[PDB]
Amino acid sequence: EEDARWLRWVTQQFKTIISLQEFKAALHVESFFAERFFALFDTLQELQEALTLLIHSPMDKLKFLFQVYDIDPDELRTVLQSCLRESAISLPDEKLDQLTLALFESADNGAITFEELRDELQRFPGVMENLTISAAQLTRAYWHNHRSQLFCLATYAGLHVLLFGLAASAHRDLGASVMVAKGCGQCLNFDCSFIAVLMLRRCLTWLRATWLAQVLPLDQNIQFHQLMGYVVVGLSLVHTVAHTVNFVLQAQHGSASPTGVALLLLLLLMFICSSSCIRRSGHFEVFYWTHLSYLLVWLLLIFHGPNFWKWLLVPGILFFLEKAIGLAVSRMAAVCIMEVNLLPSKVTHLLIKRPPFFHYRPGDYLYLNIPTIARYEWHPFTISSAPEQKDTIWLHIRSQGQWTNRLYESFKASCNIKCYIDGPYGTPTRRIFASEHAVLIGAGIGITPFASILQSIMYRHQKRKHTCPSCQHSWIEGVQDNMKLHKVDFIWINRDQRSFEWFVSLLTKLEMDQAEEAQYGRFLELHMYMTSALGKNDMKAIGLQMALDLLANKEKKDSITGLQTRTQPGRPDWSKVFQKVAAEKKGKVQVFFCGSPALAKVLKGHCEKFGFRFFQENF
Amino acid sequence: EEDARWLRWVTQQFKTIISLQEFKAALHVESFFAERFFALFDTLQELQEALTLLIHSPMDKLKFLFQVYDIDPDELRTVLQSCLRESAISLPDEKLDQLTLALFESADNGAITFEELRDELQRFPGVMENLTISAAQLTRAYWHNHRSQLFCLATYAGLHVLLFGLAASAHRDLGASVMVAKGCGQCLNFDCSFIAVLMLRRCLTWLRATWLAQVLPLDQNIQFHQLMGYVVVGLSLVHTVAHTVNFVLQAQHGSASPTGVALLLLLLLMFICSSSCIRRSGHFEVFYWTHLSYLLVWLLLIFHGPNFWKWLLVPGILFFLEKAIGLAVSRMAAVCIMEVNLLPSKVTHLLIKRPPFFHYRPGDYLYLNIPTIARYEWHPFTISSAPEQKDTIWLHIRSQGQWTNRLYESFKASCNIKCYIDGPYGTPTRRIFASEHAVLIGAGIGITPFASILQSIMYRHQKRKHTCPSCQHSWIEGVQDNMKLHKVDFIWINRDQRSFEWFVSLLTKLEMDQAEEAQYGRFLELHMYMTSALGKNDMKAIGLQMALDLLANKEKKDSITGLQTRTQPGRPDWSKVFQKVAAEKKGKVQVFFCGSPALAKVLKGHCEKFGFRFFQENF
Amino acid sequence: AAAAAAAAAAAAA
Amino acid sequence: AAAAAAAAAAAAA
Ligand SMILES: Cc1cc2nc3c(=O)[nH]c(=O)nc-3n(C[C@H](O)[C@H](O)[C@H](O)COP(=O)(O)OP(=O)(O)OC[C@H]3O[C@@H](n4cnc5c(N)ncnc54)[C@H](O)[C@@H]3O)c2cc1C
Ligand SMILES: Cc1cc2nc3c(=O)[nH]c(=O)nc-3n(C[C@H](O)[C@H](O)[C@H](O)COP(=O)(O)OP(=O)(O)OC[C@H]3O[C@@H](n4cnc5c(N)ncnc54)[C@H](O)[C@@H]3O)c2cc1C
Ligand SMILES: NC(=O)C1=CN([C@@H]2O[C@H](COP(=O)(O)OP(=O)(O)OC[C@H]3O[C@@H](n4cnc5c(N)ncnc54)[C@H](OP(=O)(O)O)[C@@H]3O)[C@@H](O)[C@H]2O)C=CC1
Ligand SMILES: NC(=O)C1=CN([C@@H]2O[C@H](COP(=O)(O)OP(=O)(O)OC[C@H]3O[C@@H](n4cnc5c(N)ncnc54)[C@H](OP(=O)(O)O)[C@@H]3O)[C@@H](O)[C@H]2O)C=CC1
Ligand code: HEB
Ligand code: HEB
Ligand code: HEB
Ligand code: HEB
Ligand SMILES: CCCCCCCCCCCC(=O)OC[C@H](COP(=O)([O-])O)OC(=O)CCCCCCCCCCC
Ligand SMILES: CCCCCCCCCCCC(=O)OC[C@H](COP(=O)([O-])O)OC(=O)CCCCCCCCCCC
Ligand SMILES: [Zn+2]
């Protein structure tokens, strides 16, 4: 259809004007494809004849493109770049390089020839069909997601209105500038003291395990802290201008005001150094030191706020209790990063040698620390390797910020770095492994625990396949006191596989490893929806990844043919999905969700309709 | 030897005097045995002839005793009672009844006859040899055990001396009766407030998991509380006599003194009702209600002690925080007691139907509550059933007090009672199952967690024995990611099997179930030392128990013959024990201890000498 | 006594 | 460029 429309537009443009510039003007393009096309064609007769051979046979189009670019690794890469409609979801440049190297290598010792490249391409099972062949805000779901964060902000702002009003009411006598100063002061009392508590990452790991994470957001703490910081830096400035306007009106000693100048300067230091520009530049120790002055802001303020010491006492005792409860070897282990693979789309894969007595459940995160990157920063990362894997511990660290970017870009320029992990934290997932026909649903980017969970499911499910050493009558034993599932679905819904190419390759690996066994029964079904690729024609970058993975583990297309038809574009149709889950009879379905709350309620509705036992796992 | 000495003493007594009273006087005895002996003998010739037949053939002695008691269940029981030198360790009366019923039943429809009873006795493999056949404070180890308790008492008494002295020093102005009253008051402030904290059984379950239990005693809390109670009842009486002597000296309004009379009366109520006589009698709700007045003693005292509210505030906030953190269904489960077996020596065996999602590690206790016994009392009990047992949960509840006695004696007069258990608490024992040639050592009565641990070891070790369904080539697979042990010793040292007859039967059961396999390798070795039976002749009550258990599970004596030679009397010889453990090569020995600290240090010495990795498990 | 009834029940059982 | 050297090294490897 597009070829016919292109031909019609060319015929209309030809009748409207052939020079090289006119040809490019008709094509509405600078184009290396256009210049070589002219050089190989060198009139209306020539253009129509060339187009007819180019229009009226995909392999012929690819040969045409080959001769156009023919003027051999770097050139074939440009051919494949020309043969990809990079529209919504894309093939990462690392995977593109791998694909081009795989074609060029198996084809050929120097440059390749298009004739044998043709049969080499036909030899690839899935590269042909996936290479496109051509020449050239307001929703109820939004508020349903953000109602918890909005209620936290509203409680904060309401408490501030309460304190400001109660202070300005009592101090209504003093005129027009002690009201403002007293209001701002009564606010600062609470703002500082409780800007402390947001950083009890020894207590957030405990509150996150409970159901409280479902009601109040526990992952916004760092940026609620950066918000209390800004309100402090605003209210202290208003406090200071109020107390200097008051002294000016008094114009027309004590240790309260000079400590005030000291606090204003210390806060402007903690506010200038805490910007993004200080950690964006590779200064991760300079940020940490200048913030270490929150002690001096907390010291000067005790000698400033006559009643401040109570505020600072309760959260301050909490905070230093925690900072003391954590010492050098509390739960740390100076493990060694064994290998570091830089997966495509800027994600770092760390294999860190497992500590001997390091036992974790699947879906357990850990706080990672790498002194080469940042000496005092502890970021949390989900263990994306099943516990049954005994040698190493995986972590897939997607570049979402300044520390993780530093980790990647530091390894890219270059692997035994010094690493101090901090223990396994996580909700227990034994509800899953004690179930039947679980339906693991996951949405968005919170699926790194599903990597560990699916790998552990598959390890435990292949562990119950015994093979007799004598007569090799391999049978399948029943439940093994650890696992009970008769079936496991997994539905991954995400806008695109942007940083999760490792996850798509993981789902491909699980389907490869249990599609040789699917003739008699299929245990795991791995769905995938993309919700941004409008039509299956757009999900051709994932077909390329799967056909590329089929060549690291040399297998037949029938291994993936199950996953190819469950890798769908656009949103799901939950009616059909749950109804098919119901059509199978493998136990009592127990949906497990890990995603936003609007989708959580949609699924809870459909689930309690169909009679499944919904859950919402918070990992 | 004893027969010859008896004969010599009889010959000497005969030459010193035969009437029935003279015969009893010579025997130094009322004796049903003596009267029948006279009646069957009816002179020096008769006595010597009867003794010669009685002296110069064990079965003949038993037939003699039979004819003596012959004048048939109750009579045979007396025969066996006569044929047992109940000296240091004993055969419990329930086991005696079982033994007599087992003999009488298999022998015979009415009374039994001694002739066939002879061959019936010879048919029992171990009953013959174990039935004796005849006619008739200051040690460094002590302080090493109690140094922690002594340091706790010394810190308490030193803090009291500090408070009393600091109060009587400042108030040295007021004369000779406000010094005493002020000292006692400054003591009461702390005594009440911190008599609270000892009852944070939601925090003791957390402190007991840690290593702090090794340094300070966490099992004396109830009776440190009963000690702070008595010091409060003494100091408040001295406080009151001081403030009445002071007012008498003032003889020669306010709300401080009448609240004083109220506090004195409330404390005398909490002290009269809290005696032992109130819970010894089956009043377990009356004790709980009258103690519920600690609130009113805590109320009146806020209106009494001007500074008391701070003391009461910190531990009082702690205490009510805990009492609120625990609510109706926090971790409770209104399980049903399936069956109740009353094991011998007053121990109750509860099988409580396991809650579906009740997962515990071996060695995990639980707080049991039975409203029929005591409506508000929660006693802790170790789960003595391996987690692999899926149906029920065992608890062996030895009668050591008033609630446990009430439970037993209530079931004895009589089984679906209402039970609200409270969760699994316990230190992780994965150090054991991840080891090789573990040496579980246990001493005293703290071995109920070793029951669960050994049952779980054996379940997991038999789980790795696969049997091919086709050709039945049964092989033994290697480690299964849960268990690694190649060998497991277990040494149980105790003064006697007083309440632990169930444990001796459990060790017998484990040896029966893995002696049918020992022909090629022996996994578990179960030692037993008795440390109060001076010689192996005394450990004949355990031989009877083992020969009785060999007849519930009909087996050959070769099943136990391993355990019979490892069931030794008197203390161990640790040199030989550890040296034999070293002679075997099954990995690196990892001793695990559960017992007193004097023995812990003895074992740590021997262990670090031999090169094993000592532990001290605190369960 | 109690054990006689026990033997009677065991024989009857 | 950089990828040409990569292909050369891969062929040599
Ligand atoms: C349980 C858990 C598991 C996670 N697992 C992964 C994972 O496997 N891979 C991955 O790429 N990311 C993961 N993250 C999120 C995130 O990328 C890292 O945890 C962390 O943000 C890395 O710091 P950064 O320098 O990239 O962030 P920054 O650039 O410093 O900040 C950017 C964003 O990260 C947040 N952030 C910053 N510092 C922290 C911190 N210390 N803890 C949490 N959030 C922070 C900020 O709120 C902001 O949203 C996980 C988060 C949680 C809570
Ligand atoms: C972890 C743990 C596991 C135990 N497991 C068992 C078991 O399996 N079988 C068994 O017979 N005993 C066990 N006990 C000890 C004891 O018999 C019971 O825990 C409890 O004492 C029963 O109350 P009681 O009425 O018999 O005690 P009481 O007659 O009221 O008191 C007598 C003794 O018991 C202690 N005691 C009283 N109340 C409690 C209480 N609530 N908690 C702890 N100690 C108390 C007193 O300090 C005193 O030493 C265990 C104790 C602990 C700490
Ligand atoms: N405790 C809390 O307060 C939590 C809050 N959140 C909030 O979740 C919000 C959303 O994050 P995000 O996960 O990106 O938003 P979504 O959950 O909307 O995106 C998740 C996936 O669900 C798909 N999806 C959404 N609605 C439907 C539907 N009706 N039927 C089928 N598929 C659907 C989306 O596709 P499409 O692209 O078509 O939407 C997207 O691919 C975040 O802003 C965060 O604040 C997250 C976790 C917990
Ligand atoms: N955290 C703490 O503070 C703890 C304190 N304890 C204290 O432990 C004290 C003792 O309780 P108990 O366990 O009865 O005392 P023991 O530990 O002495 O009795 C335990 C067993 O060990 C045997 N035994 C003792 N010494 C030796 C030895 N040198 N060689 C071989 N066997 C030996 C004893 O036999 P014999 O009969 O010959 O002694 C006894 O059978 C209690 O009073 C309690 O206070 C208990 C646990 C921990
Ligand atoms: C932090 C931050 C901050 C800052 C910066 C400041 C700064 C200041 N400031 Fe201030 N304040 C404050 C915070 C603050 N502040 C507070 C919190 C308070 C308290 C208030 C109350 O409490 O009332 C005050 C208070 C306050 C007062 C009162 C007095 C008393 O003591 O009472 C005054 C006068 C002030 C001044 C001042 C000045 C002058 C300044 C500058 C120079 N100061
Ligand atoms: C005074 C008080 C205060 C203030 C004002 C502040 C203010 C602030 N801040 Fe802060 N912080 C703080 C206090 C504070 N702060 C603390 C305490 C902490 C913690 C640290 C640690 O942990 O050590 C923090 C921390 C923090 C962090 C973390 C780091 C990591 O990553 O890990 C961040 C990001 C921030 C930011 C901030 C900002 C932006 C601001 C504004 C200015 N901080
Ligand atoms: C709990 C027990 C107790 C008791 C029973 C008592 C009882 C009494 N008490 Fe007596 N108190 C007390 C505990 C007490 N308490 C205290 C704790 C105090 C405080 C002291 C101070 O802090 O200094 C007092 C104090 C007191 C005082 C002082 C005053 C004020 O407020 O400062 C007085 C006068 C009294 C009296 C009295 C009396 C008269 C009596 C009897 C009737 N004291
Ligand atoms: C005022 C304060 C006080 C006092 C004085 C006392 C005093 C006393 N206490 Fe008493 N307790 C108490 C407060 C008290 N408390 C408390 C709070 C408790 C807890 C209870 C519950 O937990 O609820 C007790 C508890 C108690 C117990 C536990 C019960 C069971 O077993 O579980 C006992 C045994 C007692 C004893 C006693 C005594 C003997 C005395 C002396 C009188 N404690
Ligand atoms: C353990 C403790 C848990 C605490 C939970 C705290 C939950 C609430 C945290 C709120 C943080 C926040 O606003 O998010 C940063 C936003 C971007 O958020 P998102 O849309 O990416 O989710 O970036 C923004 O756009 C911020 C705009 C917010 C402006 C609010 C002004 C409030 C003024 C108050 C004055 C009294
Ligand atoms: C979580 C908190 C943990 C707290 C740990 C407390 C550890 C110390 C508890 C002391 C309790 C105690 O004394 O034991 C009761 C003894 C019998 O003990 P045992 O010999 O059976 O172990 O029975 C007695 O014989 C008691 C005699 C003690 C007399 C002490 C007098 C002290 C007077 C002080 C006045 C200021
Ligand atoms: Zn076989």
Author numbering:
A (entry chain A), B (entry chain C): 4 to 20, 27 to 38, 40 to 52, 60 to 73, 75 to 89, 96 to 132, 136 to 163, 180 to 295, ...
C (entry chain D), D (entry chain B): 6 to 18
List sentences from the manuscript.
NADPH oxidase 5 (NOX5) catalyzes the production of superoxide free radicals and regulates physiological processes from sperm motility to cardiac rhythm. NOX5 catalyzes the electron transfer from cytosolic NADPH to extracellular oxygen to produce superoxide (O2-) in the presence of intracellular Ca2+ ions. Like DUOX1-2, Ca2+ activates NOX5 by binding to its regulatory EF-hand domain (EFD). Each protomer contains a catalytic core with TMD, FBD and NBD and a regulatory EFD.
Focused refinement followed by symmetry expansion was performed to improve the local resolution of cytosolic domain of NOX5 in the pre-reaction state. Here we first use the pre-reaction state to describe the overall structure of NOX5. NOX5 forms homodimers rather than homotetramers as previously reported. Briefly, the TMD contains six transmembrane helices (TM1–6) and binds two heme molecules, and the cytosolic DHD binds FAD and NADPH. In the pre-reaction state, EF1 and EF2 have a low local resolution, which only allows the assignment of secondary structures. Part of INS1 displayed a helical density that should belong to PhosR, extending from the FBD and packed against the EFD. We observed a helix from the PhosR motif in the pre-reaction structure but not intermediate state 3 structure, docking against a negatively charged surface on the EFD. PhosR may stabilize the EFD in the inactive state, but this motif is released upon phosphorylation, facilitating the transition of the EFD to active conformations. Instead, the corresponding residue, Val362 and three other residues (Cys235, Val275 and Leu332) are located between the two hemes and might contribute to electron transfer. The distance between NADPH and FAD, which is >10 Å, is not optimal for transferring electrons, as NADPH and FAD are solvent-exposed.
